[model samples]
Target: SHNLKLRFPAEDEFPDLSGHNNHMAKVLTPELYAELRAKSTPSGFTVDDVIQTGVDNPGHPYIMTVGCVAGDEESYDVFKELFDPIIEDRHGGYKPTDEHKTDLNPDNLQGGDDLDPNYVLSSRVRTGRSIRGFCLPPHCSRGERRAIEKLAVEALSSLDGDLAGRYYALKSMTEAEQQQLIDDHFLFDKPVSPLLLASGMARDWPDARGIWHNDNKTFLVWINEEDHLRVISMQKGGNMKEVFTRFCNGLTQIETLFKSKNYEFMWNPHLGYILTCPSNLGTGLRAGVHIKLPHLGKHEKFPEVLKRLRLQKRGGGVFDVSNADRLGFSEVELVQMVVDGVKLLIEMEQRLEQGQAIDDLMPAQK
Candidate 1:
């Protein structure tokens, strides 16, 4: 076994010093913790490895952190006792028995185009993919990381036409170059989240990690980030249809290339995608837009409206609005949820601007 020597806390060592009512704090009962404490995945992932982040950083939200990280695809099943409840709660009641579905057909998506440009600034959709037969990021060895980089570059370099791009290995990237990529929001910075830091994802920084992006910068991929690959499609303005179409095309092509090499993305019928993080299971898709809604955002009912639509908003005025649920829903359905919800948000904002009541537009309370 190529397992890293992980340090396990004593039976009396575990405690919820973290003040937040995160899923980890809520789900990890003493009985379940004791039951899982001595177990380890074939790849050498232990219960301690799964909950180390939460144990170390009691101040962190660790919401959706799952108090878990899969060392290999089987880690999810091996640790299902702890992972199941957190997954169900975080994904809006996605149960263990429920199977996840995926539909990437762009034609199935509807009404995501022609949003009022004044409010909708840009659109982006991204998903994470992990190659099977390797330990996930948190448990992968340095050699394994380099192998993943080599394979990713080989596959990405084969992309042709508009999807074509070059890979920039982090080890060889200059400071200015790295800064430029960061400025343009095309590169990931060093891990700052205590959760990420504790998970050992940043073990050998800038060694085999890298990024790839098209010349237009609309299509990009982050190699060896939180996941093995963060495939992305984005552009200025809210033409979500175009963004999602490019995402589907680029992702499908890459998946094909990976398959040609006799490799497959880690996936499960129940989980959809076997990511290091439990929250990213299912399609692993996050489709979103940065839209200005200064007035509507300030409305007391704004948060409630967002919750009702299964959407999330970050930042004030210009909100990073996106679908909240990741599992138990198809890719197209999730994107459609954001598209339709954003359209409604924009309409409500317009009504507010016209000094009209938006009460009628509010989603009925569940």
Candidate 2:
């Protein structure tokens, strides 16, 4: 029940040079903000663009909702590199902890802060959320896109430079090189393992997230283009190597970015949770507390009551400019909200025990 939405810019805004992820759209300068606020700028940039541009942008990270427990501050700063400023400074720079990093032990899941589920059973697990995405958006040359991917992968690889030797199963050789491949700075010896080594300028993996090959809903990507380069997939459900590699590949890169001083953390007032993001903007990170409840609350109307658990406001009020809405609430608040919401959601289970017909509750996912 813990849903985390983490986003960051793939490349620099200037020259953007390669125009990564619509570089111009991603840059949020003070002048640009003023121009748009006063209606001086033309209708071009989108909400995402403005978000990408914020001067405080820290390659934002957020903890949307937690199903862990009431009054729990789980996953407060899991998304951004902004946890414990002193700790980061002590290390000479920022360093992100994997969702599991918070899980030094199985009992304590630090990142969940409070959003992760307290009870198992019906649930969605994002533990192994690995993404090796790439795409050539307009204005971005294949080379630039590749550069972005290299950076993304390098960031990902940072998760476990220590475990690099264990991922042999996930590494595969490319059968056909992706045209977008860039050879410039990519590693050649690939000593650390292609998973650790550069993805190469020849064949390339797509974006951070890719359309599920079979079910468009799911996403896919690999450590490398190689057929044998062990694909640690969520949908495929294969060997342990794939699963372990999948988790390592996706999380490590996030760890690398936390090294950025730009990232910061803040407590939220709107949703009652702590949050972190690049710019520490309002509506820090928009996230939902999706749940697999035993049933809807009996004392309240299912649909209407659910709204209380949803995120609405972003800027001003209780939240600091330090990421007010990304997940809508500070990490601490979100967890309490989600855990409370789940309790209400579970209350409906009593309805089931009472033999109440809850056909509407079984609605299909849209």
Candidate 3:
């Protein structure tokens, strides 16, 4: 059957470039698949080492797992051509003229005092960053990983004000202390992916992994997690401007420090920032707000409403609303999108509380 053949292309002598299945895997052509497998990737990974999820996975078939795509030009090309469309959609066909918008102007932010305290618990803005010289997670060596930590730690120590903090090595911390940090959401304990473990990112264990958090825990950085650096800024309330301002300031300082040493970030003209996942290829920023949508969330069209607004939810309960597209939108724009959507959702919730019909908020079905 064509369906089975698509899933298990290897059965018909199509080389299984992705170790798992060809379900969502894309290539310029079939011959390109054979070529990529025969040729070693730019960063030393071979095609056979990569895998794509089958029909059951949420990831589109076109995406070869995020971490592995950047291994070579061919894989990167395939991911860009395929995943970019799904991510960019109408945002495509135009060249991005300006540098990435990193500014977080307070005046432009919506839903500041407008959102209810009970509804919006807090908002967070975080982005993943990595250096250009070092190899990324999938093929990163022990030496490269340690170097990344050392270099980042050295620069981070020089930070001042709210971004200032000492780096705490995971190996040096007590288990209880680690748990405390994780409980506070100030640290990344460990990745749960068996695939990442097998790929050697977690090989040296917690030897070089660690986190840096400000005295208030509002500004934080995760070293050697999914990426070389996972810089984050979060706080209570819907003041996106403040959360993102903190994030931008922190990121700029880190980048500035690296620049002083003549090091550069892994940046691209098309891909604003590179990440392990192709989905996070462009902005690599996820600015989310945790808000209760008890009324709207219960409706059948909640998902549709979110999709129309280009938003995403994390869990079932209290809504963890964030921007849906990471590739096309700028960091600031995505944050604005989420903020605006939350404002709309809040208004809908208010009407619901006033005894408005649920159908009024839903889109018409086709």
Candidate 4:
């Protein structure tokens, strides 16, 4: 039933391999491993290919390293023995029986525009899309990668007016040009994560990888990065309505163009968008803002506040605030979460500046 030439490590070597405590380590018992080790999906994606990254680098936490990557859409179904538990644990207890729903209507969103510019620097929303009938990045053949690149470029070229843009092939891009895109945060850096490097996504260097962006650079598409296409809409300040409207419009346009060519983005009722990473299986969307929260960010209750609000904080007093949950929530609902969360955060910051307590503003603990 499978043709991929794959080998499993001897049982003696398993204990020395070091990865434990991750979903992969916890779910993949010796019996289960032996049973699955030799198997391969219809697309020729093997079990060994799915767990290579975790086996290679055990030190990285599951959050930083996905531990497993889907080789093709079928990898999720064929390897549910491994993917199901990992996905459930990572996506906040999303059960295998649960179905995902999408809502991209910008009109459904409320009160997300016009935040204080002093506190909010920029707002961005992005989602990953994988074309049906192709292997994902982890097991995509060189020709398959090139084919995706061609189709993506063709679709992007069809865009007109505000969404019109040009594609820059990484293989042919000059150093100066590449650096410029990097400086502007418009291009992806070559894969440095052990998971990406070990998962085979970074192989062949920049052969078919590229970036597309409009003149204003507000609308962009990353072709063949972690996902087939990372459609993004971003702009300075906290006008999420504008950013989200553009994102919805641009993504719908791209989807229509791809459909015209008889291609469809992979989708599953249970998983929503079928992406390479299990963590991104649901909406495959992340809407965030880089907002400066000098006072509130340093507060003792900040972490708890973020956790309760379903937000995350990264480096700098300027927090990378966004909706933490993905699955079981619609795109508009997720974006609205960020909008409401950010507005509350700004309010808390101002209260702190005035030497007032923000305990009353905090969302009750879940």
Candidate 5:
């Protein structure tokens, strides 16, 4: 309960923020529109709306649901005393420094254990809350945020020296490669991506391929074009209460981002996608929320809970043709999680925009 709240979007929350000149319910490309209509749509489920909702339609419940549990609240004095000088001015904005490290694991305990966060967070306390509300400006700075901030600070510092070649290389490459090539050039103030450390591969499978990789139940994506987002997740792999809380807080962060960046539309991964398959009609929201319900698993309800959450019996949802691997997980028990995975990312984007803490959902709290 670390001050995460959801403000429901009022009627004026998202007002037709689409590409079309006329603001209305429907918005799409001619070819894509025809493709959607041709599909066998289920009653009450509008594929058009899902796509339209993403395109130019603004004015929905752009809720800001916050899920938080912090290490400890930095009182106003503490926040004020230390937050600046290093971070930035909430009003004047942040400035950069040169003290960040890309490979800042300090311990450098390679062989993977040093990078094992799942194990690291195993002992921390967790909480859950449905921050299903709406609106407004937002975000994180902490171990995670510090790392990123430092990376930016350091990279900017090297702009004139050793990194000049790296910068030129990036300018020549495609958008997809920009995230990883920066690493290859060693021009970062710090590593630009989290996954780069665990696996040398940048978030993009290949420079030209902007899409993420889905191997079996594990999926990953770069939520930001400028940043590489590495999600080493399993189906039904996360704690539900924790994830629910994250969604609340995460959305709040994301909603705030739209305002500051003037991002009228974006591609959201948490929602379901429109594929030729017929199983996704009821909820074109190719959405899946993975919950680590240990107690439920003890009660013989974990599998069923996954079922209810959209894990289908057939090969479907999120696992597209390009990605799918059994990886020892039962398709029946595993929840199709591309949707929920995307949700976490969306909320995180919001949090980052506001310069909030980016470490584990929050500090440990019971």
Candidate 6:
């Protein structure tokens, strides 16, 4: 039996089972690994090779424990057969919508309804895309990995205007230049990705890893990183339409270039976009805003508020909010939800500062 309990005996005894499950049993127990390895998927990669990190290192802080065996019905079955207890998703699961709900042109985006001068700092929209020819991480070798970066550089380097950018090889960058890119949030340095290294996804080291960014640094692309590509569009202030519009243009251009070479992005009718992790299965789009919410951040019931609204909170400082799920909403819909929710939250926070009352907005006394 591929029961999760037997495979992950330690988790049963461990307290605080809060985050994404790290199906560690699949690797901790030799017998379990053997069984899964023996069962080959249609993609010719065994369950072991694809899901190594998820099984061997469960409870990774960032939650990188999900993998798929190609997007076919048989491949999906193998993925679910072993991970059913954890993910519990069925086949033909949530697909993404082609039409965007919110308008992408800057003038049409919602929530310019009187926001504080610096209350909201910046906005960004990101989407993950994988190529069709190669195997998903860990299983890919140096030759195939290098090819991905080379092709990506060629395609992106040809852009003429707003999207025009330069490819940067991580290996050639000075320590200061690398640090500067990270500080500006325009680059990704793979040595910092623990989950990727642990899962054997960082096999080739700095050989094929790099980043592409426009001169203004508003539009960015991460090549051969978490996904083959993470197309990103961001800028200062909370204007979603502007960010999304740029992203849409970049996404289409990249896809067109890849297709011109007779290559396809990995996609399934049911899954939409195939990523390394199941959490990012649908639109693979995460749009967000960084806003100040000192009052709401300290509230006891605020977490519940976010959950009810289906939004995720992040950032090292006061408050940042983004849509919580990619399973149901389209790219624009999710971004719009976050934009509207932040607007309401900003209003409430201002009201509280102005002596307005609430039933349970305050923290309980010790």
Q: Which candidate's TM-score is highest?
A: 4
> lDDT tens digits, residues 8-124, model 2?
222222212122232222333444433333211121212222232222222223521111110012222231112233223322233344111121121221232233243322211
Better of 1 and 2 by TM-score: 1
Error of 4 at 339 (Å): 0.3
Worst 10 residues of 5 by lDDT: 129-138
lDDT by residue for model 3 (51-113), tens:
332212333356434323344233444444443443343233333343444434545555454
Per-residue lDDT of candidate 1, residues 86-107 (tens digit): 8888888888999999899999
User: Candidate 6 residues 295-347, lDDT tens each?
Assistant: 77776667776776668897734677887767445666677777767766776
Preferred candidate (TM-score higher): 4 or 5: 4
The lDDT of each candidate is 0.85, 0.28, 0.67, 0.85, 0.25, 0.66
> What C-alpha lDDT, on a 0 to 100 scale, does residue 343 get in candidate 4?
84
> How much is 35 displaced in model 6, in angstroms?
7.4
Q: Kindly list the per-residue Cα lDDT of model 4 for residues 1-366, writing each as its tens digit.
A: 332233435464343345444556656677777667777787778777788777776654434445778999999988898899888888888888998898989999998888778999999998999999999998999999999999999989988899878989988899998888988799786899876888989978788999999988999999999999999899999899999999999989988998999999999889999898888988898899999998987899989888887877675587888878878888998998888888888999999999999988879753
In terms of TM-score, how similar is model 1 to the real structure?
0.93
RMSD (CA, Å), candidate 1 to true, equals: 2.7
In lDDT terms, how accurate is model 6? 0.66
Per-prediction TM-score: 0.93, 0.33, 0.81, 0.94, 0.21, 0.78
Candidate with more favorable, higher lDDT: 5 or 6: 6
Error of 6 at 320 (Å): 2.0
Worst 10 contiguous positions by lDDT, candidate 1: 1-10
CA lDDT, candidate 5, residue 314: 21
What is the descending TM-score order? 4, 1, 3, 6, 2, 5
